[PDB]
Structure formats: C-alpha cells, structure tokens
Design a protein around this ligand. Structure first.
Ligand SMILES: Nc1ncnc2c1ncn2[C@@H]1O[C@H](COP(=O)(O)OP(=O)(O)O)[C@@H](O)[C@H]1O
Ligand SMILES: Nc1ncnc2c1ncn2[C@@H]1O[C@H](COP(=O)(O)OP(=O)(O)O)[C@@H](O)[C@H]1O
Ligand SMILES: Nc1ncnc2c1ncn2[C@@H]1O[C@H](COP(=O)(O)OP(=O)(O)O)[C@@H](O)[C@H]1O
Ligand SMILES: [Mg+2]
Lengths: 513, 513
C-alpha cells in the first residue's frame, strides 16, 4: 500500500524547516523559511514568536505540496514531531492567544543582572547551588531567568501575570500551543530540563525553585515524554489544517541537540554526537542514571520514549567558535577564498611546526569556563605561513573537544564508544582525521544530512506505530542511510605531545576586559 | 665658479651602489651591482671580497657615464666618500694583494663557539667585561671574533700571520686598500668601534684586548676620522680611473648606520635617527662624552669630522623584524597583495580594539633581551580583521622603538629632541604618526631619502671644502631638500592603553625551548 510519512518541524535559531520522512527514514520533501534576528541592544537577541509560527506553517504547506507532486497517493502524514532551539522563552496571553513581547533567545545576555543576583542571594555565591536538582549552573541561557526578566521589565507580561492569563514556554510549547489553536499547553522532558525549573531525575517541576525565582507555576506547561500524544494540528494558518487532510497528531517533541543525539542512533551508554554549527554542542548518552559534572559540563535529559519508558540521560559540553573560526580565517583574515582551500592548505604542511592557535574569540567554554580568554597565536617564526595557521586552527578544534571528552569520561566513568558528527565542518576531512586520532575514537559522518530533524520524526513515528522498536529503527537506518567512518591514525606520544603543547598555550590566553 | 659633485660608495650586505651628489645635496646619478651571498654551512654568511671591489668599480664607471649623458655641467667628482656594512671582516695578503678567503658577514654565526669561549675564559661568565672599554658585549657580530675564527679555521690566514703579510680589515679598509692600489691601510673611528679592539675613550686600539684575543697589532690598520684624506683612487679594474678621468681623492669613510645619523643631520646631542628597514637601527647622538647602557644597547662613535676633531658618541639599538613583518603578513599570511595596502587597511580602523601583535619571530632584543620570545597575537575577537592585525604590527614596531628610546634617554641623561627617519617604512604615514604620539617628539621625514649615501658624501665634501661647515650643510639641506614634520597627535589615555596592552602581551611571548 501507500507509504507512511512522518513530518518533522525543525525550528532553529536562524530558520524553520519542515521535513517529511518516509518509512526508510529518508527525507523526501523539505522547505525552509528564515526569521528575523532582532538585536535591540548589545548582547541582546530576540525572535518574533508569530514570525516563527507563520514560518513553520509556510514550511508545512509548501513541503506538503511538493510531496503530493512526487506521490499523488500521499493523503496524510501519520504524525508530526517537533525539534527546536532550546531555552528561547516565549511569553503569551492565553486569551488573546498573542505574545506580550519578543522572545529572548538562548544566546541573549540581557539576563546578566538577574543571573548575578540569583547566585548571590539564593546560591550564596555558588552558581552550582541547584545543580543536583536541575543539572545546571546559574547562567544567562536558561529559561527561568528570561521569564524573571520579562516579569520585571515588560509591563504587559506583569499585566498578564497580575491578572492570571500569563503563559511561559520554550519554542516547543509555543509551537504546540499555536498549532493547536490554543488547545495544548505542554512540553517535553528535554526542553523542560533547560528551564532551571525541573528536577532532572524526577522530571517534574520544582516548586522550591519556582517560588525562589519568583515564577508562578500557573504560567508553566505540563511535562510529557519525547514520544506520546501532545495534541493535534488545529490551525488554518497558512492553510495547514487543510493541507494536512486527515487530522494530524503531534506525537514528538525534543530539544534540537537531543534530537541530533537520537536521530544519530546514540542509544547506548558512551555513544555521542557532536553537532557543528557556528559553535558546536557535544552530547553523550550516559545511561539511565543521571551523571553530575565536576568539570563544567551540563547534566540533561537525553531522551524518554513514552510516559513510563526508560529515561536516558546525557552530559553536555559546548564550545563557541568552530565553524565561525574557519569563516573568520576567510572573511576577516583572507587566509583563503573558497572553503575548499581551507583543507588544501592545512594538508599542504607536515604539522603546525611550533605554533598554537587558540581561537577563543568569545572566551573559553568547553570545560574550562574562562570568559577572560581571547583569540591568541603563540610560537610564530618567519617560517610560519597561513597553511600552518589554518592547520593549527583545525588542531585547536580537535583539542578543545578532547578537553570536553576528557571531562565527560571522568564525570560519567565511561569511555566514548563512538562519535557521530554532522554540520558545516563535518565535511572537512583533515579535521575528522585529527579529531579521530586525538580522541582515539571512531568518527561517523552520516551521508543523510537530516539527522537533527529525524530525531523528532523518530519520536513521532515510534508513538504513531510507523516504527515499532529502536532495534527496527536501527535496522532501517543501517539499510538506508550510509556513513563514512574515520578511525584513529596517530601514535600515543603524538597525542600526549600535542596536548602538552596545547596546555602551555592555554596559559597565555587570558586577556579579559 | 663651477658645479661641484661628491661621490658616495655605499657597500651593503647584498649590493654595492655608487651615488653622485651635487652641491645642493641632490642625488643626480646612481648605479647598483649585487654580489654573491655564500652560505656554505647553516647560519653562515660569507662575501667574496674581490667581487665586492669589482662591483664598487663597476658602480662608479656606470654612474659617472650615466651622469655625463644627462648633465653637461658635470666634469669630475671632487671627492669620494665610503659607507659600508659594518663588522664584516676581510683577511688579505699584503704581497698578493688578494684575500685568503671570503669575508664572514656581520650576521654570520660561525663565531658562536669562540664567543662563548671569550665570555667564559676572559669574561668569567660576564659578556660585559670589556663594555666600559669598547662599548660592546661579547657577540658574534664584532670583527675580533671573526678574525680569531680565521686564524683558527682558515690555514691560509694562519699561514699569512706567521710571515707578517696578513691584513685584517673591515669593508671600509678593504675598499680603501684596493681603491688605492695597496697604498692605504686605514680605518675610520666608527668602523673601528665595531671591532671589539678599540678603546672608546682614546679612539685607539687596545693593546690589552689585542693581547687577550690574540690579534697582533701588525694586522690592524691605522684609525683615522670620518672626514679627511685617506688616499686616492689608483686602479682601473672596471675602467673606473678613466671614468673618473681626473685624479680623485678618498675623503670620507663612515659605517653605514653612523652615515645615516650624519646624513640625517644629527649633529647635536639629543638628536636621533631611525632606519625603518627589514629591521630598525636606532642611533642617538649622546654628545662628546661616551654614554654606557645598562639595557644592552651599544655604545659607539657617532662621527668625527677632521683629524683628531670633536668626537660625538652614540647609543645604538635594534629591532629584528620591522619591514620583515610587513612582508611576512603579505607573502606568508595573504593579508594584502602588495605594499600600498598595508597603510590603507591599517588606517580604515580607528584602533586595534584590544589586540596586540608582538612580531618577536626571532626573539626580543632592545632593553628586554629574550631569544625564547616568538611571534604572538593576543586579544582577538570575531570583530578582529586582517586590518586590525596589520595596524597592530605597525603599532608593535613603534612601541618597540619607544622602549628603546626610553632606555636611551635614561642612560644618556638627555631628552629626545627629535627623530629623523629613513629606510622605506618611513613612507608609511600612519606608522610615523603612531611613532610621534608614542615618543612625544616631532618626527622628521626627509624628501631626499638617500640618507646613508649622503652621510659619506657629506664627510667627503666637508673634507674637500664643497661644504665649509655643518651649519652650512644643514642650511643647504633646508633650502634644497624639503622635510616633512609629523607632530604627536594622540590621547593621554590612548597612549596609556596602548603601552599597557603592549606590556601585558610581552609577558605572554615566552615559548621557545
Ligand atoms: N524504495 C522505495 N520504496 C518506496 N518508496 C520510495 C522508494 N524510493 C523512493 N520512494 C518514493 O519516491 C518519492 C521520491 O523520493 P526520492 O527523492 O527518490 O527519495 P530517495 O532519493 O531517498 O530515494 C518519495 O515519495 C519516496 O517515498
Ligand atoms: N521496505 C523497503 N523499502 C525500501 N527499501 C528496501 C525495503 N526493504 C529492503 N529494501 C532495500 O534497501 C535498499 C535501499 O533502497 P533505496 O532507499 O531505494 O536506495 P537509494 O539510495 O537508491 O534510494 C534497496 O537495495 C532495497 O532493496
Ligand atoms: N640597515 C638598513 N638600511 C637600509 N635599508 C635596509 C636596512 N636593513 C634592511 N633594509 C632593507 O633593504 C632595502 C635596501 O637596503 P640595502 O642598503 O640595499 O641593503 P644592503 O645593506 O643589504 O645592501 C630597503 O628596502 C630596506 O627595507
Ligand atoms: Mg532513491
């Protein structure tokens, strides 16, 4: 009979995408719509919630139209999954169905003042004071502090709060709310874990933290798993309820990085995913028992398939400048013109030969949180060329991830089994070879470019019966979607010497204000 | 009354050049002939003395032939001045009139083993043991150690020493010897001050230093001033005498850096010159009393006009990578296509916005000696561009000079009156402006920049009576050749910030070994 299709909304920081998958886990139809990156002040970033909603709607109707062209028997989508940029918080009124203000992005720094105040007055100076509850440090990124800011600075948000019509929610909630025409007010365990308001292990809202951070629990949605019935697409914007035909259940919701972990089949303990973009996030599945960090890392939910399915937890490490570093060498420094020359020049030299380039342009994150760190090159002679500098940048990305991986291994008591990588820099062959040799792990690069989107589609498809088990999911994946493997090709001393050289260079990165 | 002309032989590390000046101090003819750069062993550099002499004669006959084509008033050259690469030492036989080997160049490093031996055995671990006598530390550069190497390693030189036919001479002596047809064996006070054999206070050879270093006084020439009769040109090697037509006296001899000091009219104490070339050589007139450094700067003779005349001393400082940095950014780093873009890109930004680039590619010299220092960049953000790196390099050159100048001012017990500039990077308007703001003195840019050649021509012309006083020399210069004056135009906090950043960066430069 006809193919079963699963649709995935991939709502990213810069754009929204709807991707329709079939039973082969193959992306058969795609549409993308970008949205506005509002920066009203320095360090501020916010998105127009209604623009994001309309973008998703357009993506759906266009992708549906394109598929019916390829398959005329395509009448319905079995279920829809959502995957989203995390932490970004929307504030809306439950009567007008409208947002009270623009949504502060995960990246936004406006919450700095509140962040300081929380650590000092509630944490007594310790930013890790609630880390055994949330798995998180006090930071500008997490949803709670953005909520507090909107209560303190936006009169309309406080007006909705004082009346009792205020709703707070991350992008998954907002989308599910508007897609349902105001009928659903829900969130998944992964998104909820990024709010600073959820107990990580019990996966329930914490009244202790909600009251301390002055957030009314009346403004918070219901927490569900990643794979179950969330609601139904009940909106004719932009003709989506029509474009859909059979009434379509929303059955998947999962944070973007977690969706990548899931979509790359990282089901076992020690299986990890590094998602490349401007920076990169590294997530490792640490098993069913939550692991807490002594070395800067985040403790988060990996995935939970079903209301009482096993919850797999993860450790998370972020480094800020990856793809941005390679482009920096291009648009800012003129080291190359085409991004194909980047690897060509880097491979044209036997080594860095004395130099180390620490591309800490936005400070040191990884495990060693040092906001004073800056971009720095040491050890240069007159024999130093752009080729050695580019290769040093590639070595640096590898060494930075090694610092994260090392920290993850110690925090989890678990070796990195294998590493999946996708995104802009996963194409760079030399970077992969250096990373594989330095980490001592196999690097798997998916030939299918839509593994982030696939995660939410897998969550929905499992809930909708398109796929019946993770073992079937894995079997279909192996049959349909190939991958390149990059194995270690370096020596033991070659690694130790490179790290020792790296450690010496880090000492000189401090620059500060 | 007829037009008067003075010739200048400029014998450098890479080429020889004859420049004819008229009485207006205008360069009216020039020809350049290179000589072979012999590098038999790594770090070694050697010059064929007969090739250098042949080149000098070739340069003279061609430049003269060129002049009479375009100048009907040119009849003869009144006098010839010589200016030469210092320290480079020639060993020749007094009977064959030919060298026994090639001449080790000033930057040649074959004398390292001997230089460590002198510091150990004669100095007692102190390389400054004869600094109060010579003004120099024990170093590979200076002639005495090259002479010693020739007696230890070259059998012909050791053999000539036995018979009493061996002559040691710096380039001024070798040329003066061969030009005269073996009739003159003399050196000027500036060139002699670079042998490690002259006493600064007496301006004579030190019997004790000759005794200690086993260099017989039979091998050394007679020390004279920079301006007087040395001899006559009595050779027709490349048709030179014929070109000269009339008999021509050699009336000027001065080391290349001192010649720039003289060419730039630094006749008064407090007046300084800097040659912005591949590296920087800073010379400051310290007066009629020798001033000694505690910052590793060299004490030397600046000039002496006339037999036993007033002897003005100098302090000398150098930086390794000035022009070499600008070129390095172009070829090795692709920061710009060719020379003109360096200034334009650097000017396009108001400042360096936090970054510091310390181009210590071959260590730090000046008042902070550190061979372990390497090329370093600190403070980079994603806002940093190639333009910022270029401007930072220019700032770094100026900052290094500021440190050298400061150290000179303290030891000499005098303020910097003004800085005259030449070399090539003096054409960079922004570099001059930054330099002026950092120093707090006006910077003088001669529109006639053949200043090194001018010094020897002035020396010869003063002895020949073409110019009758230093006061008239300046008057002619002021009337005929226009100066560009660059006044300090910075902010107290901007200079304060630039120096403070520079200071921090220097601490992060240690790397080598
Ligand atoms: N082996 C297959 N079995 C069933 N349907 C398929 C198969 N291959 C392609 N299709 C269908 O053909 C349409 C076009 O997809 P296409 O771009 O060819 O997919 P792919 O490139 O992944 O094979 C889609 O609707 C897809 O479901
Ligand atoms: N139910 C199925 N749907 C699609 N392909 C299947 C199925 N069962 C087995 N296969 C096999 O999986 C392989 C992948 O097919 P397909 O995705 O069409 O390849 P392509 O990359 O050319 O699109 C084929 O060799 C096919 O025989
Ligand atoms: N001390 C110096 N004086 C003048 N130019 C120098 C010096 N050192 C390096 N240079 C560079 O060499 C070029 C010409 O100098 P030149 O006198 O021909 O060198 P050399 O002394 O080796 O013959 C200039 O463009 C300049 O950048
Ligand atoms: Mg196909």
């Amino acid at each position: 009979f006809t193919m079963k299709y699963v649709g995935s909304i991939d709502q990213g920081t810069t754009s929204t995408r709807f991707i329709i998958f079939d039973e082969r886990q193959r992306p058969v139809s795609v549409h993308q719509v970008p949205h506005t990156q509002h920066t009203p002040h320095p360090g501020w970033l916010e998105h127009d919630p209604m623009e994001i909603f309309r973008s998703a709607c357009k993506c759906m109707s266009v992708a549906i139209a394109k598929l019916r062209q390829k398959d005329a028997s395509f009448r319905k989508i079995e279920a829809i999954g959502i995957t989203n940029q995390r932490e970004t918080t929307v504030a809306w009124d439950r009567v007008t169905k409208e947002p009270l203000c623009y949504a502060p992005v995960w990246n936004d720094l406006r919450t700095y003042d509140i962040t300081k105040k929380v650590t000092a007055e509630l944490g007594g100076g310790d930013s890790m004071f609630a880390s055994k509850i949330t798995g998180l440090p006090v930071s500008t990124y997490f949803a709670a502090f953005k909520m507090r800011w909107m209560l303190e600075n936006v009169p309309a948000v406080a007006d909705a709060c004082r009346r009792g019509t205020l709703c707070f929610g991350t992008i998954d909630t907002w989308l599910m709310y508007k897609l349902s025409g105001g009928k659903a007010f829900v969130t998944d365990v992964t998104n909820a874990s990024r709010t600073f308001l959820m107990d990580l292990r019990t996966r329930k809202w914490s009244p202790e933290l909600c009251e301390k951070l002055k957030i009314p629990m009346e403004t918070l949605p219901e927490i569900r798993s990643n794979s179950e019935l969330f609601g139904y697409v009940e909106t004719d914007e932009c003709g989506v309820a029509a474009a859909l035909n059979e009434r379509t259940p929303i059955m998947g919701s999962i944070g973007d990085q977690q969706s990548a972990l899931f979509g790359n089949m990282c089901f076992e303990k020690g299986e990890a995913k590094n998602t490349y973009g401007t920076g990169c996030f590294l997530l490792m599945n640490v098993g069913e028992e939550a692991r807490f960090s002594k070395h800067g890392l985040l403790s988060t939910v990996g995935f939970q398939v079903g209301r009482d399915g096993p919850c797999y937890y993860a450790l998370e490490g972020a480094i800020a400048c990856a793809g941005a570093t390679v482009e920096w060498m291009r648009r800012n420094m003129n080291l190359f013109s085409h991004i194909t020359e980047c690897e060509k020049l880097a491979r044209s030299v036997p080594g860095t030969q004395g130099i180390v380039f620490v591309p800490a342009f936005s400070g040191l994150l990884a495990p060693y949180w040092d906001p004073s760190a800056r971009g720095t090159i040491v050890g240069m002679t007159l024999k130093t060329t752009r080729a050695h500098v580019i290769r040093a940048a590639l070595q640096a990305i590898a060494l930075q991830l090694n610092d994260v991986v090392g920290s993850m291994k110690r925090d989890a008591g678990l070796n990195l089994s294998s590493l999946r990588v996708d995104g802009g820099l996963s194409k760079n062959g030399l970077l992969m070879e250096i990373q594989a040799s330095l980490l001592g792990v196999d690097i798997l690069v998916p030939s299918m470019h839509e593994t982030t989107a696939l995660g939410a589609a897998l969550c929905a498809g499992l809930a909708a019966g398109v796929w019946t088990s993770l073992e079937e999911v894995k079997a279909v994946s192996r049959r349909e979607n190939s991958w390149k493997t990059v194995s270690p090709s370096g020596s033991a001393m070659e690694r130790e010497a490179m790290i020792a050289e790296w450690r010496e260079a880090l000492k000189r990165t401090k620059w500060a204000k």
